[PDB]
PDB file of C-alpha atoms and ligand atoms in Angstrom:
ATOM      1  CA  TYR A   1     140.634 191.023 -67.715  1.00 39.68           C
ATOM      2  CA  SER A   2     143.806 190.102 -65.579  1.00 37.61           C
ATOM      3  CA  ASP A   3     145.377 186.811 -65.681  1.00 38.38           C
ATOM      4  CA  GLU A   4     144.307 186.639 -62.035  1.00 36.83           C
ATOM      5  CA  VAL A   5     140.850 187.320 -62.596  1.00 33.20           C
ATOM      6  CA  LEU A   6     140.738 184.873 -65.629  1.00 34.78           C
ATOM      7  CA  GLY A   7     142.564 182.321 -63.311  1.00 37.25           C
ATOM      8  CA  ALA A   8     140.015 183.089 -60.330  1.00 37.35           C
ATOM      9  CA  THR A   9     137.064 182.463 -62.825  1.00 36.36           C
ATOM     10  CA  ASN A  10     138.168 178.851 -64.478  1.00 32.84           C
ATOM     11  CA  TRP A  11     139.199 177.715 -61.337  1.00 32.87           C
ATOM     12  CA  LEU A  12     135.675 178.143 -60.075  1.00 36.38           C
ATOM     13  CA  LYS A  13     133.762 177.481 -62.759  1.00 36.21           C
ATOM     14  CA  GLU A  14     135.493 174.010 -62.890  1.00 36.69           C
ATOM     15  CA  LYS A  15     134.281 173.455 -59.283  1.00 34.24           C
ATOM     16  CA  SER A  16     130.767 175.085 -59.983  1.00 32.97           C
ATOM     17  CA  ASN A  17     129.389 171.772 -58.943  1.00 35.72           C
ATOM     18  CA  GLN A  18     131.319 170.226 -56.383  1.00 37.35           C
ATOM     19  CA  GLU A  19     129.429 169.067 -53.383  1.00 35.13           C
ATOM     20  CA  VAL A  20     130.985 170.716 -50.325  1.00 36.46           C
ATOM     21  CA  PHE A  21     130.178 171.281 -46.736  1.00 38.33           C
ATOM     22  CA  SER A  22     129.495 174.748 -45.402  1.00 37.92           C
ATOM     23  CA  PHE A  23     130.793 175.450 -41.604  1.00 39.34           C
ATOM     24  CA  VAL A  24     130.463 178.877 -39.807  1.00 38.48           C
ATOM     25  CA  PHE A  25     132.847 179.247 -37.338  1.00 33.38           C
ATOM     26  CA  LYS A  26     131.924 182.088 -34.782  1.00 32.95           C
ATOM     27  CA  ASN A  27     132.360 183.172 -31.300  1.00 33.97           C
ATOM     28  CA  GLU A  28     129.832 184.513 -28.771  1.00 37.66           C
ATOM     29  CA  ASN A  29     130.026 186.965 -25.430  1.00 37.01           C
ATOM     30  CA  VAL A  30     131.094 185.765 -22.451  1.00 38.30           C
ATOM     31  CA  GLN A  31     131.143 186.632 -19.189  1.00 37.48           C
ATOM     32  CA  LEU A  32     132.877 184.802 -16.152  1.00 41.69           C
ATOM     33  CA  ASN A  33     133.189 185.925 -12.739  1.00 39.85           C
ATOM     34  CA  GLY A  34     132.747 189.217 -13.777  1.00 41.21           C
ATOM     35  CA  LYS A  35     135.457 188.724 -16.356  1.00 40.23           C
ATOM     36  CA  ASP A  36     134.033 190.146 -19.932  1.00 44.83           C
ATOM     37  CA  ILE A  37     135.390 187.787 -23.104  1.00 46.46           C
ATOM     38  CA  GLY A  38     134.213 189.398 -26.031  1.00 44.78           C
ATOM     39  CA  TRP A  39     134.816 188.835 -29.759  1.00 44.99           C
ATOM     40  CA  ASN A  40     138.316 190.056 -30.079  1.00 49.41           C
ATOM     41  CA  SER A  41     139.640 188.500 -26.630  1.00 50.89           C
ATOM     42  CA  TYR A  42     141.623 185.942 -28.455  1.00 54.34           C
ATOM     43  CA  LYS A  43     144.549 187.764 -29.504  1.00 57.27           C
ATOM     44  CA  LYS A  44     147.450 185.409 -27.863  1.00 60.50           C
ATOM     45  CA  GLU A  45     149.535 184.890 -31.083  1.00 60.03           C
ATOM     46  CA  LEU A  46     150.503 181.010 -30.283  1.00 58.94           C
ATOM     47  CA  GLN A  47     154.465 179.975 -31.174  1.00 59.47           C
ATOM     48  CA  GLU A  48     153.458 176.867 -32.894  1.00 58.91           C
ATOM     49  CA  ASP A  49     155.192 177.058 -36.345  1.00 54.94           C
ATOM     50  CA  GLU A  50     152.264 176.244 -38.301  1.00 56.53           C
ATOM     51  CA  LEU A  51     149.770 178.643 -36.901  1.00 56.30           C
ATOM     52  CA  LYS A  52     152.557 181.496 -37.170  1.00 58.49           C
ATOM     53  CA  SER A  53     152.933 180.552 -41.021  1.00 59.15           C
ATOM     54  CA  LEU A  54     149.518 180.709 -41.200  1.00 61.29           C
ATOM     55  CA  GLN A  55     148.929 183.869 -39.538  1.00 57.63           C
ATOM     56  CA  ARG A  56     151.433 185.340 -42.126  1.00 55.54           C
ATOM     57  CA  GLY A  57     149.260 184.041 -44.881  1.00 54.61           C
ATOM     58  CA  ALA A  58     146.380 186.184 -43.676  1.00 56.47           C
ATOM     59  CA  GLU A  59     148.516 189.127 -43.188  1.00 52.81           C
ATOM     60  CA  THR A  60     149.686 188.885 -46.708  1.00 52.11           C
ATOM     61  CA  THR A  61     146.222 188.196 -48.096  1.00 52.17           C
ATOM     62  CA  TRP A  62     144.922 191.405 -46.645  1.00 49.34           C
ATOM     63  CA  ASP A  63     147.818 193.430 -47.827  1.00 48.61           C
ATOM     64  CA  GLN A  64     147.423 192.377 -51.362  1.00 50.28           C
ATOM     65  CA  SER A  65     143.976 192.960 -51.649  1.00 49.11           C
ATOM     66  CA  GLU A  66     144.019 196.167 -49.710  1.00 51.72           C
ATOM     67  CA  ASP A  67     142.622 198.844 -52.101  1.00 50.08           C
ATOM     68  CA  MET A  68     144.600 201.649 -51.933  1.00 50.16           C
ATOM     69  CA  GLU A  69     142.945 203.985 -54.211  1.00 49.63           C
ATOM     70  CA  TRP A  70     140.642 204.088 -51.161  1.00 49.15           C
ATOM     71  CA  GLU A  71     141.436 204.587 -47.144  1.00 49.96           C
ATOM     72  CA  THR A  72     141.055 202.320 -44.781  1.00 52.42           C
ATOM     73  CA  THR A  73     140.258 202.789 -41.397  1.00 54.93           C
ATOM     74  CA  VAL A  74     139.445 199.269 -40.075  1.00 53.03           C
ATOM     75  CA  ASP A  75     140.791 199.173 -36.342  1.00 52.40           C
ATOM     76  CA  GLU A  76     144.217 197.731 -36.216  1.00 51.15           C
ATOM     77  CA  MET A  77     142.919 195.112 -33.058  1.00 53.17           C
ATOM     78  CA  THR A  78     140.328 194.097 -35.589  1.00 54.27           C
ATOM     79  CA  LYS A  79     142.234 193.235 -38.199  1.00 52.36           C
ATOM     80  CA  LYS A  80     144.618 191.443 -35.546  1.00 52.78           C
ATOM     81  CA  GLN A  81     142.136 189.561 -34.405  1.00 51.72           C
ATOM     82  CA  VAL A  82     140.867 188.256 -37.502  1.00 51.98           C
ATOM     83  CA  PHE A  83     144.155 187.483 -39.245  1.00 52.44           C
ATOM     84  CA  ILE A  84     144.710 185.336 -35.586  1.00 48.81           C
ATOM     85  CA  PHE A  85     141.209 183.462 -36.078  1.00 47.22           C
ATOM     86  CA  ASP A  86     142.233 183.016 -40.070  1.00 44.83           C
ATOM     87  CA  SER A  87     145.101 181.000 -38.594  1.00 43.52           C
ATOM     88  CA  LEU A  88     142.980 179.154 -35.621  1.00 43.50           C
ATOM     89  CA  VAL A  89     140.198 178.184 -38.236  1.00 40.33           C
ATOM     90  CA  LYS A  90     142.687 176.978 -40.958  1.00 36.55           C
ATOM     91  CA  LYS A  91     144.471 174.730 -38.100  1.00 36.82           C
ATOM     92  CA  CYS A  92     141.201 173.076 -37.072  1.00 40.32           C
ATOM     93  CA  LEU A  93     140.479 172.265 -40.690  1.00 40.52           C
ATOM     94  CA  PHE A  94     143.964 170.725 -41.149  1.00 41.97           C
ATOM     95  CA  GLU A  95     143.736 169.067 -38.230  1.00 49.74           C
ATOM     96  CA  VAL A  96     140.477 167.335 -38.682  1.00 53.13           C
ATOM     97  CA  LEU A  97     141.944 166.322 -42.513  1.00 50.47           C
ATOM     98  CA  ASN A  98     144.840 164.742 -40.398  1.00 51.24           C
ATOM     99  CA  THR A  99     142.849 162.501 -38.598  1.00 51.28           C
ATOM    100  CA  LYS A 100     141.143 161.272 -41.583  1.00 51.81           C
ATOM    101  CA  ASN A 101     144.350 161.111 -43.287  1.00 49.27           C
ATOM    102  CA  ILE A 102     143.490 163.485 -46.390  1.00 51.02           C
ATOM    103  CA  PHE A 103     146.064 164.985 -48.337  1.00 53.07           C
ATOM    104  CA  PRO A 104     145.774 168.733 -48.432  1.00 54.02           C
ATOM    105  CA  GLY A 105     145.693 168.752 -52.215  1.00 52.19           C
ATOM    106  CA  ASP A 106     142.682 166.270 -52.110  1.00 47.77           C
ATOM    107  CA  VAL A 107     140.728 169.337 -50.976  1.00 46.73           C
ATOM    108  CA  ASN A 108     138.613 171.746 -52.000  1.00 45.49           C
ATOM    109  CA  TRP A 109     138.012 174.825 -49.762  1.00 45.24           C
ATOM    110  CA  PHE A 110     137.024 178.423 -49.178  1.00 45.22           C
ATOM    111  CA  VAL A 111     137.329 180.749 -46.009  1.00 44.09           C
ATOM    112  CA  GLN A 112     135.651 183.912 -45.662  1.00 42.22           C
ATOM    113  CA  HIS A 113     135.579 186.228 -42.651  1.00 39.42           C
ATOM    114  CA  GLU A 114     132.634 188.657 -42.386  1.00 38.41           C
ATOM    115  CA  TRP A 115     130.467 191.318 -39.790  1.00 37.40           C
ATOM    116  CA  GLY A 116     127.134 190.049 -39.530  1.00 36.73           C
ATOM    117  CA  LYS A 117     124.673 192.759 -38.473  1.00 38.87           C
ATOM    118  CA  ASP A 118     123.488 190.820 -35.371  1.00 38.99           C
ATOM    119  CA  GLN A 119     126.276 188.224 -34.572  1.00 39.17           C
ATOM    120  CA  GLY A 120     129.246 190.450 -35.657  1.00 37.04           C
ATOM    121  CA  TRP A 121     132.717 188.609 -36.507  1.00 38.49           C
ATOM    122  CA  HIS A 122     132.255 185.025 -37.941  1.00 39.67           C
ATOM    123  CA  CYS A 123     134.195 182.935 -40.490  1.00 40.82           C
ATOM    124  CA  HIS A 124     132.163 180.461 -43.542  1.00 40.79           C
ATOM    125  CA  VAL A 125     134.154 177.768 -44.799  1.00 38.74           C
ATOM    126  CA  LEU A 126     133.249 175.564 -47.485  1.00 37.57           C
ATOM    127  CA  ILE A 127     135.122 172.249 -47.806  1.00 38.55           C
ATOM    128  CA  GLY A 128     135.242 168.984 -49.747  1.00 39.02           C
ATOM    129  CA  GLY A 129     136.454 166.401 -52.124  1.00 39.19           C
ATOM    130  CA  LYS A 130     136.678 163.137 -53.242  1.00 36.25           C
ATOM    131  CA  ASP A 131     137.392 161.607 -49.421  1.00 35.83           C
ATOM    132  CA  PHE A 132     134.087 163.631 -48.239  1.00 40.76           C
ATOM    133  CA  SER A 133     130.628 162.375 -48.162  1.00 45.65           C
ATOM    134  CA  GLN A 134     127.298 163.946 -46.563  1.00 43.60           C
ATOM    135  CA  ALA A 135     127.232 161.538 -44.061  1.00 44.20           C
ATOM    136  CA  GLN A 136     130.203 162.784 -42.409  1.00 42.23           C
ATOM    137  CA  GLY A 137     128.997 166.332 -41.797  1.00 42.20           C
ATOM    138  CA  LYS A 138     128.069 165.856 -38.132  1.00 40.05           C
ATOM    139  CA  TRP A 139     131.329 164.349 -37.410  1.00 41.82           C
ATOM    140  CA  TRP A 140     132.993 167.033 -38.966  1.00 42.16           C
ATOM    141  CA  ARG A 141     131.110 169.649 -37.060  1.00 39.48           C
ATOM    142  CA  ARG A 142     131.562 167.894 -33.832  1.00 38.06           C
ATOM    143  CA  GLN A 143     135.130 167.615 -34.325  1.00 36.91           C
ATOM    144  CA  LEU A 144     136.017 170.853 -35.795  1.00 37.07           C
ATOM    145  CA  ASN A 145     134.456 172.114 -32.748  1.00 34.43           C
ATOM    146  CA  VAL A 146     136.294 170.556 -30.397  1.00 34.79           C
ATOM    147  CA  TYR A 147     139.267 171.701 -32.129  1.00 34.01           C
ATOM    148  CA  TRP A 148     138.094 175.042 -32.431  1.00 36.20           C
ATOM    149  CA  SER A 149     137.193 175.396 -28.369  1.00 34.92           C
ATOM    150  CA  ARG A 150     140.521 174.024 -27.835  1.00 36.35           C
ATOM    151  CA  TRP A 151     142.385 176.860 -29.874  1.00 33.44           C
ATOM    152  CA  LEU A 152     139.955 179.385 -28.573  1.00 34.83           C
ATOM    153  CA  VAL A 153     141.094 178.934 -25.056  1.00 35.94           C
ATOM    154  CA  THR A 154     144.530 178.634 -25.918  1.00 36.21           C
ATOM    155  CA  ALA A 155     144.466 182.043 -27.569  1.00 34.92           C
ATOM    156  CA  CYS A 156     142.285 183.708 -25.058  1.00 33.35           C
ATOM    157  CA  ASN A 157     144.020 186.936 -23.612  1.00 34.78           C
ATOM    158  CA  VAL A 158     141.562 187.023 -20.694  1.00 29.99           C
ATOM    159  CA  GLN A 159     143.404 186.180 -17.813  1.00 31.34           C
ATOM    160  CA  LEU A 160     141.385 182.911 -16.494  1.00 32.90           C
ATOM    161  CA  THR A 161     141.572 180.610 -13.589  1.00 33.03           C
ATOM    162  CA  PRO A 162     141.912 176.906 -14.674  1.00 34.14           C
ATOM    163  CA  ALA A 163     137.988 176.313 -13.952  1.00 33.58           C
ATOM    164  CA  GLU A 164     137.143 179.492 -16.145  1.00 35.59           C
ATOM    165  CA  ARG A 165     139.322 178.015 -19.159  1.00 33.08           C
ATOM    166  CA  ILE A 166     137.138 174.683 -18.745  1.00 35.74           C
ATOM    167  CA  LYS A 167     134.111 176.579 -18.438  1.00 36.02           C
ATOM    168  CA  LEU A 168     134.977 178.505 -21.580  1.00 36.15           C
ATOM    169  CA  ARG A 169     136.199 175.380 -23.342  1.00 37.20           C
ATOM    170  CA  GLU A 170     132.473 173.972 -22.481  1.00 38.82           C
ATOM    171  CA  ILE A 171     130.273 177.240 -23.875  1.00 40.78           C
ATOM    172  CA  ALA A 172     132.227 176.962 -26.967  1.00 38.66           C
ATOM    173  CA  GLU A 173     131.231 173.455 -27.718  1.00 38.95           C
ATOM    174  CA  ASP A 174     127.559 173.457 -25.776  1.00 37.72           C
ATOM    175  CA  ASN A 175     126.910 176.487 -27.725  1.00 40.90           C
ATOM    176  CA  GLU A 176     128.230 175.179 -30.798  1.00 40.89           C
ATOM    177  CA  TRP A 177     130.617 177.456 -32.184  1.00 39.77           C
ATOM    178  CA  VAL A 178     131.050 175.990 -35.469  1.00 39.41           C
ATOM    179  CA  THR A 179     127.713 175.525 -36.971  1.00 38.59           C
ATOM    180  CA  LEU A 180     126.885 173.195 -40.000  1.00 38.18           C
ATOM    181  CA  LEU A 181     124.675 173.604 -42.491  1.00 40.96           C
ATOM    182  CA  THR A 182     121.236 171.812 -42.562  1.00 40.67           C
ATOM    183  CA  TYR A 183     118.508 171.642 -44.196  1.00 42.59           C
ATOM    184  CA  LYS A 184     115.187 173.456 -42.293  1.00 38.93           C
ATOM    185  CA  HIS A 185     113.488 171.058 -39.972  1.00 37.43           C
ATOM    186  CA  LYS A 186     111.842 170.940 -36.551  1.00 35.27           C
ATOM    187  CA  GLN A 187     113.455 171.156 -33.336  1.00 33.70           C
ATOM    188  CA  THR A 188     112.658 167.821 -32.771  1.00 30.71           C
ATOM    189  CA  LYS A 189     112.643 166.057 -36.194  1.00 30.19           C
ATOM    190  CA  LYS A 190     116.238 165.094 -37.556  1.00 31.30           C
ATOM    191  CA  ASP A 191     118.632 167.252 -39.248  1.00 27.44           C
ATOM    192  CA  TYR A 192     120.362 166.617 -42.619  1.00 30.03           C
ATOM    193  CA  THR A 193     123.448 167.768 -43.999  1.00 32.34           C
ATOM    194  CA  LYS A 194     122.864 170.570 -46.882  1.00 28.82           C
ATOM    195  CA  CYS A 195     125.952 170.054 -48.926  1.00 30.45           C
ATOM    196  CA  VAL A 196     126.464 173.503 -51.324  1.00 30.52           C
ATOM    197  CA  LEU A 197     127.843 174.057 -54.624  1.00 30.92           C
ATOM    198  CA  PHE A 198     131.441 175.189 -54.255  1.00 29.32           C
ATOM    199  CA  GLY A 199     131.783 177.136 -57.303  1.00 27.97           C
ATOM    200  CA  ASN A 200     128.406 178.833 -57.416  1.00 23.98           C
ATOM    201  CA  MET A 201     128.042 179.372 -53.753  1.00 23.64           C
ATOM    202  CA  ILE A 202     131.717 181.462 -54.054  1.00 20.88           C
ATOM    203  CA  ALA A 203     130.818 183.485 -57.264  1.00 20.92           C
ATOM    204  CA  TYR A 204     127.096 183.937 -56.685  1.00 19.05           C
ATOM    205  CA  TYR A 205     127.306 184.982 -53.098  1.00 24.61           C
ATOM    206  CA  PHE A 206     130.428 184.986 -51.089  1.00 23.65           C
ATOM    207  CA  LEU A 207     132.443 187.285 -54.037  1.00 25.70           C
ATOM    208  CA  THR A 208     129.194 189.574 -54.307  1.00 23.46           C
ATOM    209  CA  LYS A 209     129.708 191.278 -50.322  1.00 24.92           C
ATOM    210  CA  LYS A 210     131.017 194.879 -49.644  1.00 25.51           C
ATOM    211  CA  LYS A 211     134.534 194.813 -47.938  1.00 24.45           C
ATOM    212  CA  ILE A 212     134.642 196.284 -44.909  1.00 24.72           C
ATOM    213  CA  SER A 213     136.778 199.291 -44.722  1.00 25.21           C
ATOM    214  CA  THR A 214     135.726 200.904 -41.259  1.00 25.55           C
ATOM    215  CA  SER A 215     135.382 200.538 -37.728  1.00 26.83           C
ATOM    216  CA  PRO A 216     132.654 199.613 -37.030  1.00 26.03           C
ATOM    217  CA  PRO A 217     132.302 196.931 -39.752  1.00 24.15           C
ATOM    218  CA  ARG A 218     129.670 197.290 -42.400  1.00 27.72           C
ATOM    219  CA  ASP A 219     126.793 195.462 -41.573  1.00 26.81           C
ATOM    220  CA  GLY A 220     127.029 192.148 -44.217  1.00 27.24           C
ATOM    221  CA  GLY A 221     130.881 192.835 -45.346  1.00 26.48           C
ATOM    222  CA  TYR A 222     133.607 190.902 -45.763  1.00 27.45           C
ATOM    223  CA  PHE A 223     137.193 191.285 -44.198  1.00 24.02           C
ATOM    224  CA  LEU A 224     138.820 188.712 -45.893  1.00 21.74           C
ATOM    225  CA  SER A 225     138.847 185.472 -48.214  1.00 22.44           C
ATOM    226  CA  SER A 226     140.784 182.726 -49.038  1.00 23.80           C
ATOM    227  CA  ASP A 227     140.887 179.333 -50.948  1.00 23.44           C
ATOM    228  CA  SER A 228     142.858 176.067 -51.561  1.00 22.31           C
ATOM    229  CA  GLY A 229     144.340 177.458 -55.001  1.00 21.72           C
ATOM    230  CA  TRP A 230     145.191 181.042 -53.284  1.00 20.70           C
ATOM    231  CA  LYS A 231     142.842 182.082 -56.391  1.00 20.98           C
ATOM    232  CA  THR A 232     140.328 184.763 -54.705  1.00 21.24           C
ATOM    233  CA  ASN A 233     142.921 185.749 -52.095  1.00 20.81           C
ATOM    234  CA  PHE A 234     144.372 188.843 -53.505  1.00 18.04           C
ATOM    235  CA  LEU A 235     141.759 189.963 -55.353  1.00 19.88           C
ATOM    236  CA  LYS A 236     140.318 193.212 -54.454  1.00 18.55           C
ATOM    237  CA  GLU A 237     136.650 194.220 -54.196  1.00 18.03           C
ATOM    238  CA  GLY A 238     136.782 195.659 -57.579  1.00 18.59           C
ATOM    239  CA  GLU A 239     137.936 192.335 -59.183  1.00 18.22           C
ATOM    240  CA  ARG A 240     136.004 189.835 -57.272  1.00 17.82           C
ATOM    241  CA  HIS A 241     132.789 191.560 -58.873  1.00 17.89           C
ATOM    242  CA  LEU A 242     134.588 191.285 -62.056  1.00 17.28           C
ATOM    243  CA  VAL A 243     134.932 187.293 -61.304  1.00 18.76           C
ATOM    244  CA  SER A 244     130.866 186.992 -60.432  1.00 20.49           C
ATOM    245  CA  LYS A 245     130.101 188.571 -64.013  1.00 18.97           C
ATOM    246  CA  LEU A 246     132.845 186.521 -65.996  1.00 19.86           C
ATOM    247  CA  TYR A 247     131.542 183.416 -64.122  1.00 19.37           C
ATOM    248  CA  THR A 248     127.863 183.905 -65.283  1.00 20.39           C
TER     249      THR A 248
HETATM  250 NA1   NA B 301     147.330 182.318 -31.808  1.00 21.76          NA
HETATM  251 NA1   NA B 302     140.593 183.841 -45.541  1.00 22.11          NA
HETATM  252 ZN1   ZN B 303     127.828 185.680 -43.238  1.00 25.23          ZN
END
């Protein structure tokens, strides 16, 4: 019952019932003119000051949450790419917040990088607050996907022609590399944004995942998490499960 564990539990419990959007940031494999663009083909470290700061935050979040009791054989390239994506995802969120003149302190958010059985790397984002309403969900997904596709094309480490960069930009938008949780529906029928409950989804779902410690990653595992209160960031897997236990 460290102060960090108690602090995270309390912070989540206070936001147990806060409605938030659920997004997933992802990428998909692309081949353009024989050039293979895979999930980890975005390893340029762009020298924008904010992005650099965000990437350092991801690195230190990884470092502090690492359990050194056990060995970790995650590929260095994999870690690098995840740190970079953490910075890019958050840049996208912050760019849209700026568009709406939303003070970052008025926002609750949670980010978790995972490796899915079929899709591989992806990043869950829960985000909401007083300046948010359900009807804005579609707009948010579209805007986030604009910035996500823009940054991915900038960060891509594969040498691309201008025509190929534009094609890749189009693919990331048209194939919705940012998804929004909606209620189940029919292909023809309307899709309604499905808000989730912030604290509950974190404690009862995201904090139950198993930590990736190998390459290839364990199916369904998580790499790295963070939140707007820096509450879950530094927690080791064992501590995260304690938070779930105390939250109940
Ligand atoms: Na970068
Ligand atoms: Na994170
Ligand atoms: Zn996932």
